[model samples]
Target: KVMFKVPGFDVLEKVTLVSAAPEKLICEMKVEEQHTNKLGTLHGGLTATLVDSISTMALMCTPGVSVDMNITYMSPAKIGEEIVITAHILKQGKTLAFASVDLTNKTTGKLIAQGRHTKHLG
Candidate 1:
Protein backbone atom coordinates (compact mmCIF):
# COMPACT_ATOMS: atom_id res chain seq x y z
CA LYS A 1 0.00 0.00 0.00
CA VAL A 2 1.11 3.54 -0.66
CA MET A 3 0.20 6.84 0.99
CA PHE A 4 -0.50 9.67 -1.48
CA LYS A 5 -0.40 13.40 -0.87
CA VAL A 6 -1.49 16.27 -3.22
CA PRO A 7 1.09 18.89 -2.23
CA GLY A 8 -0.85 22.19 -1.70
CA PHE A 9 -4.43 21.14 -2.37
CA ASP A 10 -5.14 18.51 0.21
CA VAL A 11 -8.78 19.58 0.29
CA LEU A 12 -9.40 18.54 -3.33
CA GLU A 13 -9.60 14.92 -2.09
CA LYS A 14 -9.19 11.79 -4.15
CA VAL A 15 -12.27 11.22 -6.30
CA THR A 16 -11.90 8.02 -8.31
CA LEU A 17 -9.68 5.60 -10.17
CA VAL A 18 -10.24 6.12 -13.87
CA SER A 19 -8.04 3.21 -14.91
CA ALA A 20 -5.48 0.78 -13.57
CA ALA A 21 -3.14 -1.86 -14.87
CA PRO A 22 -0.06 -3.66 -13.56
CA GLU A 23 2.05 -0.89 -15.03
CA LYS A 24 -0.30 2.04 -14.52
CA LEU A 25 -2.92 3.76 -12.38
CA ILE A 26 -5.14 6.78 -12.90
CA CYS A 27 -6.71 8.98 -10.23
CA GLU A 28 -8.90 12.06 -10.06
CA MET A 29 -9.22 15.15 -7.81
CA LYS A 30 -11.69 18.02 -7.39
CA VAL A 31 -10.14 21.47 -7.36
CA GLU A 32 -11.23 24.42 -5.27
CA GLU A 33 -10.21 27.99 -4.43
CA GLN A 34 -7.17 26.75 -2.62
CA HIS A 35 -5.99 25.64 -6.02
CA THR A 36 -6.70 28.92 -7.75
CA ASN A 37 -4.41 31.76 -8.72
CA LYS A 38 -4.56 35.33 -7.38
CA LEU A 39 -6.71 36.19 -10.39
CA GLY A 40 -9.28 33.72 -9.04
CA THR A 41 -8.70 31.23 -11.85
CA LEU A 42 -6.94 27.92 -11.46
CA HIS A 43 -3.24 28.52 -11.12
CA GLY A 44 -1.00 27.12 -13.82
CA GLY A 45 1.45 25.80 -11.27
CA LEU A 46 -1.33 24.18 -9.28
CA THR A 47 -2.64 22.47 -12.40
CA ALA A 48 0.87 21.26 -13.23
CA THR A 49 1.36 20.09 -9.66
CA LEU A 50 -1.93 18.22 -9.70
CA VAL A 51 -1.06 16.57 -13.00
CA ASP A 52 2.38 15.67 -11.66
CA SER A 53 0.93 14.20 -8.50
CA ILE A 54 -1.55 12.03 -10.36
CA SER A 55 1.13 10.98 -12.83
CA THR A 56 3.26 9.91 -9.90
CA MET A 57 0.40 7.79 -8.63
CA ALA A 58 0.09 6.10 -12.02
CA LEU A 59 3.83 5.53 -12.20
CA MET A 60 3.91 4.12 -8.69
CA CYS A 61 2.22 0.96 -9.94
CA THR A 62 5.53 0.15 -11.65
CA PRO A 63 7.55 0.70 -8.47
CA GLY A 64 10.04 3.33 -9.60
CA VAL A 65 11.21 6.95 -9.43
CA SER A 66 9.98 9.89 -11.49
CA VAL A 67 12.78 11.37 -13.60
CA ASP A 68 11.02 13.97 -15.72
CA MET A 69 7.72 15.75 -16.28
CA ASN A 70 6.22 18.25 -18.74
CA ILE A 71 2.90 20.02 -18.45
CA THR A 72 0.80 21.85 -21.07
CA TYR A 73 -2.01 24.20 -20.26
CA MET A 74 -5.15 23.76 -22.30
CA SER A 75 -7.50 26.28 -20.75
CA PRO A 76 -8.18 28.31 -17.65
CA ALA A 77 -10.26 26.88 -14.83
CA LYS A 78 -12.58 29.29 -13.19
CA ILE A 79 -13.35 29.54 -9.48
CA GLY A 80 -16.10 27.28 -8.14
CA GLU A 81 -15.22 24.78 -10.83
CA GLU A 82 -14.36 21.20 -10.00
CA ILE A 83 -11.33 19.86 -11.84
CA VAL A 84 -10.49 16.22 -12.39
CA ILE A 85 -6.98 15.02 -13.19
CA THR A 86 -6.48 11.61 -14.81
CA ALA A 87 -3.26 9.78 -15.60
CA HIS A 88 -2.64 7.00 -18.09
CA ILE A 89 0.43 4.92 -18.74
CA LEU A 90 1.61 5.34 -22.29
CA LYS A 91 4.53 2.95 -22.44
CA GLN A 92 6.66 0.83 -20.17
CA GLY A 93 10.10 -0.67 -20.45
CA LYS A 94 12.51 -2.48 -18.13
CA THR A 95 14.07 0.77 -17.01
CA LEU A 96 11.40 3.41 -17.58
CA ALA A 97 7.77 4.11 -18.25
CA PHE A 98 5.89 7.01 -19.83
CA ALA A 99 2.62 8.42 -18.53
CA SER A 100 0.23 11.17 -19.52
CA VAL A 101 -2.10 13.21 -17.35
CA ASP A 102 -5.14 15.34 -18.14
CA LEU A 103 -6.86 17.89 -15.95
CA THR A 104 -10.46 18.77 -16.65
CA ASN A 105 -13.18 20.86 -15.14
CA LYS A 106 -15.83 18.50 -13.84
CA THR A 107 -18.41 21.25 -13.98
CA THR A 108 -17.76 22.25 -17.56
CA GLY A 109 -16.30 18.96 -18.61
CA LYS A 110 -13.42 20.69 -20.34
CA LEU A 111 -9.72 19.91 -20.37
CA ILE A 112 -7.65 22.36 -18.38
CA ALA A 113 -4.17 20.92 -18.51
CA GLN A 114 -2.15 17.99 -19.74
CA GLY A 115 1.13 16.47 -18.59
CA ARG A 116 3.65 13.87 -19.59
CA HIS A 117 5.93 12.17 -17.09
CA THR A 118 8.70 9.61 -17.18
CA LYS A 119 9.63 7.17 -14.44
CA HIS A 120 12.76 5.10 -14.00
CA LEU A 121 13.42 2.04 -11.87
CA GLY A 122 16.65 1.46 -10.02
Candidate 2:
Protein backbone atom coordinates (compact mmCIF):
# COMPACT_ATOMS: atom_id res chain seq x y z
CA LYS A 1 0.00 0.00 0.00
CA VAL A 2 1.14 3.53 -0.71
CA MET A 3 1.60 5.61 2.46
CA PHE A 4 -0.37 8.83 2.36
CA LYS A 5 -1.26 11.63 4.73
CA VAL A 6 -4.69 12.90 5.53
CA PRO A 7 -5.70 16.29 6.89
CA GLY A 8 -7.33 14.53 9.80
CA PHE A 9 -3.90 13.43 10.95
CA ASP A 10 -3.32 17.01 12.11
CA VAL A 11 -5.32 16.19 15.21
CA LEU A 12 -2.10 14.68 16.50
CA GLU A 13 0.01 17.82 16.19
CA LYS A 14 0.59 17.70 19.92
CA VAL A 15 1.51 14.04 19.77
CA THR A 16 4.91 12.53 19.30
CA LEU A 17 5.39 8.94 18.29
CA VAL A 18 8.43 8.11 20.35
CA SER A 19 8.34 4.44 19.61
CA ALA A 20 6.47 2.39 17.04
CA ALA A 21 6.34 -1.05 15.51
CA PRO A 22 3.79 -2.96 13.50
CA GLU A 23 1.85 -4.05 16.56
CA LYS A 24 2.99 -1.53 19.18
CA LEU A 25 3.27 2.22 19.52
CA ILE A 26 4.38 4.66 22.19
CA CYS A 27 3.51 8.32 21.93
CA GLU A 28 3.63 11.44 24.06
CA MET A 29 1.68 14.65 23.83
CA LYS A 30 1.32 17.75 25.88
CA VAL A 31 -2.27 18.73 26.32
CA GLU A 32 -3.10 22.04 24.63
CA GLU A 33 -5.96 24.49 24.76
CA GLN A 34 -7.36 23.19 21.51
CA HIS A 35 -7.44 19.72 23.00
CA THR A 36 -9.26 20.85 26.14
CA ASN A 37 -12.90 21.15 26.90
CA LYS A 38 -15.05 23.62 28.84
CA LEU A 39 -13.64 22.06 31.98
CA GLY A 40 -10.13 22.84 30.74
CA THR A 41 -9.28 19.16 30.66
CA LEU A 42 -8.78 16.78 27.78
CA HIS A 43 -11.96 16.57 25.76
CA GLY A 44 -13.74 13.24 25.49
CA GLY A 45 -13.76 13.64 21.74
CA LEU A 46 -10.03 14.11 21.67
CA THR A 47 -9.57 11.00 23.77
CA ALA A 48 -11.66 9.06 21.33
CA THR A 49 -9.72 10.51 18.45
CA LEU A 50 -6.47 9.37 19.98
CA VAL A 51 -7.82 5.89 20.36
CA ASP A 52 -9.13 5.74 16.85
CA SER A 53 -6.08 7.19 15.18
CA ILE A 54 -3.52 5.40 17.29
CA SER A 55 -5.35 2.13 16.96
CA THR A 56 -5.34 2.59 13.19
CA MET A 57 -1.65 3.28 13.20
CA ALA A 58 -1.01 0.13 15.20
CA LEU A 59 -2.27 -1.80 12.22
CA MET A 60 0.46 -0.36 10.05
CA CYS A 61 -0.48 0.63 6.49
CA THR A 62 -2.97 -2.16 6.16
CA PRO A 63 -5.53 -0.63 8.50
CA GLY A 64 -8.89 -2.31 8.14
CA VAL A 65 -12.46 -1.26 8.46
CA SER A 66 -13.38 -0.57 12.07
CA VAL A 67 -15.81 -3.04 13.53
CA ASP A 68 -16.10 -1.34 16.90
CA MET A 69 -14.32 0.91 19.34
CA ASN A 70 -14.51 1.20 23.11
CA ILE A 71 -13.05 3.69 25.53
CA THR A 72 -13.00 3.94 29.31
CA TYR A 73 -11.95 7.16 30.96
CA MET A 74 -10.18 6.77 34.25
CA SER A 75 -9.16 10.34 35.12
CA PRO A 76 -8.83 13.84 33.77
CA ALA A 77 -5.75 15.26 32.08
CA LYS A 78 -5.47 19.01 31.90
CA ILE A 79 -3.91 21.38 29.40
CA GLY A 80 -0.12 21.58 29.45
CA GLU A 81 0.06 18.20 31.12
CA GLU A 82 2.03 15.55 29.31
CA ILE A 83 0.16 12.39 28.44
CA VAL A 84 1.60 9.17 27.12
CA ILE A 85 -0.17 6.98 24.60
CA THR A 86 0.45 3.33 24.01
CA ALA A 87 -1.16 1.10 21.37
CA HIS A 88 -0.94 -2.64 21.14
CA ILE A 89 -2.26 -5.29 18.82
CA LEU A 90 -3.97 -8.01 20.81
CA LYS A 91 -4.81 -10.27 17.90
CA GLN A 92 -4.28 -10.02 14.15
CA GLY A 93 -6.57 -12.67 12.85
CA LYS A 94 -7.15 -13.38 9.20
CA THR A 95 -10.46 -11.58 9.06
CA LEU A 96 -10.15 -9.28 12.02
CA ALA A 97 -7.65 -7.31 14.04
CA PHE A 98 -8.10 -6.44 17.71
CA ALA A 99 -6.05 -3.61 19.09
CA SER A 100 -5.89 -1.50 22.21
CA VAL A 101 -4.75 1.99 23.09
CA ASP A 102 -4.15 3.52 26.49
CA LEU A 103 -3.57 7.07 27.67
CA THR A 104 -1.64 7.88 30.82
CA ASN A 105 -0.55 10.91 32.76
CA LYS A 106 3.16 11.33 32.39
CA THR A 107 3.69 13.23 35.61
CA THR A 108 1.67 10.92 37.83
CA GLY A 109 2.19 7.71 35.92
CA LYS A 110 -1.52 7.05 36.16
CA LEU A 111 -3.93 5.85 33.55
CA ILE A 112 -6.22 8.46 32.05
CA ALA A 113 -8.14 6.31 29.61
CA GLN A 114 -8.13 2.98 27.83
CA GLY A 115 -9.53 1.95 24.45
CA ARG A 116 -10.24 -1.14 22.39
CA HIS A 117 -10.57 -1.14 18.62
CA THR A 118 -11.59 -4.09 16.52
CA LYS A 119 -11.38 -3.96 12.75
CA HIS A 120 -12.42 -6.20 9.90
CA LEU A 121 -9.42 -7.02 7.73
CA GLY A 122 -11.57 -7.98 4.77
Candidate 3:
Protein backbone atom coordinates (compact mmCIF):
# COMPACT_ATOMS: atom_id res chain seq x y z
CA LYS A 1 0.00 0.00 0.00
CA VAL A 2 1.10 3.59 -0.61
CA MET A 3 0.83 5.96 2.29
CA PHE A 4 0.43 9.72 1.91
CA LYS A 5 1.76 12.43 4.18
CA VAL A 6 1.62 16.21 3.98
CA PRO A 7 4.23 17.96 6.08
CA GLY A 8 3.88 21.27 7.93
CA PHE A 9 0.19 20.54 8.34
CA ASP A 10 -0.66 18.43 11.29
CA VAL A 11 -4.29 18.49 10.25
CA LEU A 12 -3.22 16.17 7.50
CA GLU A 13 -1.52 14.07 10.12
CA LYS A 14 -4.53 11.90 10.82
CA VAL A 15 -5.39 10.60 7.38
CA THR A 16 -6.70 7.06 7.74
CA LEU A 17 -8.11 4.61 5.31
CA VAL A 18 -11.64 3.84 6.41
CA SER A 19 -12.62 1.39 3.69
CA ALA A 20 -11.71 0.39 0.16
CA ALA A 21 -13.20 -1.24 -2.85
CA PRO A 22 -12.36 -1.58 -6.50
CA GLU A 23 -14.31 1.54 -7.39
CA LYS A 24 -14.58 3.46 -4.14
CA LEU A 25 -12.72 4.52 -1.03
CA ILE A 26 -13.01 6.71 2.05
CA CYS A 27 -10.43 8.71 3.95
CA GLU A 28 -10.54 11.23 6.75
CA MET A 29 -8.36 14.07 8.08
CA LYS A 30 -8.51 16.16 11.19
CA VAL A 31 -8.33 19.90 10.72
CA GLU A 32 -5.95 21.73 13.03
CA GLU A 33 -4.71 25.27 13.58
CA GLN A 34 -1.91 24.91 11.09
CA HIS A 35 -4.44 24.25 8.36
CA THR A 36 -6.06 27.63 8.84
CA ASN A 37 -5.68 30.83 6.88
CA LYS A 38 -5.20 34.39 8.15
CA LEU A 39 -8.96 34.69 8.45
CA GLY A 40 -8.88 31.67 10.77
CA THR A 41 -10.60 29.43 8.24
CA LEU A 42 -9.29 26.47 6.38
CA HIS A 43 -7.18 27.52 3.44
CA GLY A 44 -8.64 27.04 -0.01
CA GLY A 45 -5.48 25.34 -1.16
CA LEU A 46 -5.73 22.86 1.67
CA THR A 47 -9.29 22.11 0.70
CA ALA A 48 -8.14 21.62 -2.85
CA THR A 49 -5.38 19.40 -1.66
CA LEU A 50 -7.92 17.21 0.07
CA VAL A 51 -9.80 16.83 -3.18
CA ASP A 52 -6.69 15.98 -5.18
CA SER A 53 -5.27 13.65 -2.59
CA ILE A 54 -8.48 11.70 -2.11
CA SER A 55 -9.04 11.53 -5.83
CA THR A 56 -5.61 10.01 -6.23
CA MET A 57 -6.42 7.53 -3.55
CA ALA A 58 -9.57 6.58 -5.41
CA LEU A 59 -7.61 6.05 -8.60
CA MET A 60 -5.25 3.83 -6.69
CA CYS A 61 -8.19 1.81 -5.53
CA THR A 62 -7.80 -0.18 -8.69
CA PRO A 63 -4.66 -2.02 -9.81
CA GLY A 64 -3.08 0.51 -12.16
CA VAL A 65 -1.45 3.94 -12.15
CA SER A 66 -3.43 7.11 -12.70
CA VAL A 67 -1.98 9.35 -15.38
CA ASP A 68 -4.27 12.39 -15.34
CA MET A 69 -6.93 14.14 -13.31
CA ASN A 70 -8.89 17.40 -13.03
CA ILE A 71 -10.41 18.81 -9.85
CA THR A 72 -12.95 21.54 -9.08
CA TYR A 73 -13.57 23.27 -5.76
CA MET A 74 -17.05 23.60 -4.36
CA SER A 75 -17.02 24.99 -0.80
CA PRO A 76 -14.98 26.07 2.21
CA ALA A 77 -13.97 24.67 5.57
CA LYS A 78 -13.29 26.23 8.93
CA ILE A 79 -10.35 25.80 11.28
CA GLY A 80 -10.21 23.15 13.99
CA GLU A 81 -12.75 21.04 12.16
CA GLU A 82 -12.38 17.56 10.83
CA ILE A 83 -12.91 16.69 7.18
CA VAL A 84 -13.67 13.38 5.56
CA ILE A 85 -13.24 12.82 1.87
CA THR A 86 -15.15 10.01 0.21
CA ALA A 87 -14.44 9.00 -3.38
CA HIS A 88 -16.67 6.99 -5.66
CA ILE A 89 -16.23 5.77 -9.14
CA LEU A 90 -18.49 7.25 -11.74
CA LYS A 91 -17.52 5.04 -14.64
CA GLN A 92 -15.01 2.30 -15.29
CA GLY A 93 -14.35 1.64 -18.92
CA LYS A 94 -11.61 -0.31 -20.61
CA THR A 95 -8.97 2.43 -20.75
CA LEU A 96 -10.33 5.33 -18.73
CA ALA A 97 -12.29 5.87 -15.54
CA PHE A 98 -14.03 8.71 -13.75
CA ALA A 99 -14.37 9.39 -10.07
CA SER A 100 -16.07 11.86 -7.75
CA VAL A 101 -15.09 13.07 -4.33
CA ASP A 102 -16.92 14.78 -1.52
CA LEU A 103 -15.19 16.50 1.38
CA THR A 104 -17.38 17.07 4.38
CA ASN A 105 -16.90 18.65 7.77
CA LYS A 106 -16.83 16.20 10.65
CA THR A 107 -18.40 18.60 13.12
CA THR A 108 -21.39 19.75 11.12
CA GLY A 109 -21.34 16.93 8.57
CA LYS A 110 -21.59 19.49 5.83
CA LEU A 111 -19.99 19.33 2.45
CA ILE A 112 -16.95 21.56 2.10
CA ALA A 113 -15.63 20.46 -1.30
CA GLN A 114 -16.53 18.30 -4.27
CA GLY A 115 -14.45 17.13 -7.22
CA ARG A 116 -14.45 15.00 -10.32
CA HIS A 117 -11.37 13.17 -11.53
CA THR A 118 -10.30 11.31 -14.64
CA LYS A 119 -7.73 8.58 -14.81
CA HIS A 120 -6.19 6.73 -17.72
CA LEU A 121 -4.43 3.45 -17.25
CA GLY A 122 -2.78 0.78 -19.34
Candidate 4:
Protein backbone atom coordinates (compact mmCIF):
# COMPACT_ATOMS: atom_id res chain seq x y z
CA LYS A 1 0.00 0.00 0.00
CA VAL A 2 1.13 3.51 -0.78
CA MET A 3 -0.30 6.74 0.50
CA PHE A 4 0.70 10.29 -0.38
CA LYS A 5 -0.29 13.47 1.34
CA VAL A 6 1.38 16.80 0.82
CA PRO A 7 0.57 20.49 0.84
CA GLY A 8 0.04 21.15 -2.83
CA PHE A 9 -1.27 17.66 -3.29
CA ASP A 10 -4.19 18.18 -0.94
CA VAL A 11 -6.56 17.61 -3.85
CA LEU A 12 -5.41 14.01 -3.83
CA GLU A 13 -7.13 13.56 -0.49
CA LYS A 14 -10.19 12.64 -2.52
CA VAL A 15 -8.26 10.14 -4.62
CA THR A 16 -7.84 6.56 -3.54
CA LEU A 17 -4.94 4.53 -4.82
CA VAL A 18 -6.14 1.16 -6.05
CA SER A 19 -2.72 -0.17 -6.93
CA ALA A 20 0.87 0.92 -6.88
CA ALA A 21 3.89 -0.70 -8.41
CA PRO A 22 7.35 0.28 -9.40
CA GLU A 23 6.28 1.66 -12.76
CA LYS A 24 2.59 2.32 -12.46
CA LEU A 25 -0.20 3.56 -10.25
CA ILE A 26 -3.98 3.33 -10.41
CA CYS A 27 -6.28 5.72 -8.63
CA GLU A 28 -9.98 6.48 -8.47
CA MET A 29 -12.14 9.28 -7.18
CA LYS A 30 -15.73 10.27 -7.24
CA VAL A 31 -16.70 13.58 -8.77
CA GLU A 32 -17.98 16.16 -6.34
CA GLU A 33 -19.15 19.73 -6.69
CA GLN A 34 -15.76 20.92 -5.47
CA HIS A 35 -14.15 19.29 -8.45
CA THR A 36 -16.64 20.44 -11.04
CA ASN A 37 -16.56 23.33 -13.42
CA LYS A 38 -19.17 25.97 -14.12
CA LEU A 39 -20.91 23.55 -16.46
CA GLY A 40 -21.05 20.90 -13.72
CA THR A 41 -18.45 18.82 -15.48
CA LEU A 42 -14.99 17.83 -14.29
CA HIS A 43 -12.67 20.75 -14.45
CA GLY A 44 -9.81 20.74 -16.93
CA GLY A 45 -7.33 22.17 -14.47
CA LEU A 46 -8.14 19.51 -11.91
CA THR A 47 -7.56 16.84 -14.50
CA ALA A 48 -4.13 18.22 -15.18
CA THR A 49 -3.46 18.55 -11.50
CA LEU A 50 -4.23 14.89 -10.92
CA VAL A 51 -2.15 13.87 -13.90
CA ASP A 52 0.83 15.80 -12.64
CA SER A 53 0.46 14.61 -9.08
CA ILE A 54 -0.21 10.94 -9.70
CA SER A 55 2.27 10.55 -12.54
CA THR A 56 5.03 12.01 -10.45
CA MET A 57 4.03 9.99 -7.44
CA ALA A 58 4.09 6.85 -9.55
CA LEU A 59 7.63 7.58 -10.54
CA MET A 60 8.61 7.67 -6.86
CA CYS A 61 11.54 9.85 -7.71
CA THR A 62 13.23 12.49 -5.69
CA PRO A 63 14.39 15.97 -6.56
CA GLY A 64 11.82 16.06 -9.33
CA VAL A 65 9.74 18.86 -10.69
CA SER A 66 7.47 18.91 -13.68
CA VAL A 67 8.98 20.78 -16.59
CA ASP A 68 6.25 20.23 -19.11
CA MET A 69 2.77 18.83 -19.33
CA ASN A 70 0.29 18.35 -22.16
CA ILE A 71 -3.30 17.23 -21.87
CA THR A 72 -6.17 16.31 -24.17
CA TYR A 73 -9.76 16.28 -23.04
CA MET A 74 -11.74 13.63 -24.84
CA SER A 75 -14.93 13.71 -22.81
CA PRO A 76 -16.54 15.32 -19.83
CA ALA A 77 -17.40 13.70 -16.50
CA LYS A 78 -20.51 14.92 -14.82
CA ILE A 79 -21.08 15.28 -11.11
CA GLY A 80 -21.78 12.12 -9.12
CA GLU A 81 -19.64 10.18 -11.55
CA GLU A 82 -16.58 8.20 -10.65
CA ILE A 83 -13.30 8.37 -12.53
CA VAL A 84 -10.38 6.01 -12.68
CA ILE A 85 -6.93 7.37 -13.36
CA THR A 86 -3.83 5.43 -14.23
CA ALA A 87 -0.31 6.73 -14.49
CA HIS A 88 2.76 5.02 -15.81
CA ILE A 89 6.32 5.85 -16.46
CA LEU A 90 7.23 6.05 -20.12
CA LYS A 91 10.94 6.68 -19.78
CA GLN A 92 13.49 7.68 -17.24
CA GLY A 93 17.00 8.92 -17.70
CA LYS A 94 19.74 10.47 -15.65
CA THR A 95 18.17 13.89 -15.68
CA LEU A 96 14.68 13.58 -17.00
CA ALA A 97 11.65 11.35 -16.74
CA PHE A 98 8.50 11.07 -18.80
CA ALA A 99 5.11 9.79 -17.77
CA SER A 100 1.66 9.28 -19.24
CA VAL A 101 -1.74 9.27 -17.58
CA ASP A 102 -5.23 8.30 -18.66
CA LEU A 103 -8.48 9.21 -16.98
CA THR A 104 -11.65 7.30 -17.67
CA ASN A 105 -15.23 7.34 -16.54
CA LYS A 106 -15.54 4.37 -14.22
CA THR A 107 -19.13 3.51 -15.01
CA THR A 108 -18.87 3.95 -18.77
CA GLY A 109 -15.20 3.06 -19.22
CA LYS A 110 -14.93 6.03 -21.56
CA LEU A 111 -11.74 7.99 -21.82
CA ILE A 112 -12.18 11.36 -20.23
CA ALA A 113 -8.69 12.74 -20.65
CA GLN A 114 -5.08 11.90 -21.36
CA GLY A 115 -1.91 13.62 -20.35
CA ARG A 116 1.84 13.47 -20.79
CA HIS A 117 4.23 14.85 -18.25
CA THR A 118 7.94 15.61 -18.34
CA LYS A 119 9.97 16.11 -15.24
CA HIS A 120 13.49 17.10 -14.37
CA LEU A 121 15.10 14.88 -11.79
CA GLY A 122 18.28 15.56 -9.98
In order of listing, the candidates' clash counts read 0, 0, 0, 0
Against the hidden true structure, what lDDT does model 2 obtain?
Answer: 0.80
For model 3, residues 23-72, the per-residue Cα lDDT tens digits are 67777777667777887777766766666566665665453455655555
RMSD of 3: 4.5
TM-score, each model? 0.73, 0.85, 0.70, 0.87
For 9-82, candidate 4 gives per-residue lDDT tens digits of: 43455445467777777888898888888988988889988888888777774237989999999999999999
Error of 4 at 26 (Å): 0.1
Name the best candidate (by TM-score).
Answer: 4
User: How much lDDT does each candidate structure score?
Assistant: 0.67, 0.80, 0.66, 0.83
lDDT of 1 by residue, 1-122 (tens): 34443333543434444546564555555556666678788777776656656666666555467689888887887766666666777887888878887778777888887878887867
- List model 2 lDDT by residue over 27-119, tens digit each: 788888888899889877999878887677767643888889989999999888999999899998899889889899999999999989998
Q: Candidate 4 — which pairs collide?
A: none
Candidate order by lDDT, decreasing, is: 4, 2, 1, 3
How would you order the candidates by TM-score, starting with the best?
Answer: 4, 2, 1, 3
Error of 4 at 15 (Å): 3.9
lDDT of 2 at 37: 93
List where candidate 2 sits over 4 angstroms from the true fold: 1-14
Candidate 4 residue 111 C-alpha distance from true site, Å: 0.2
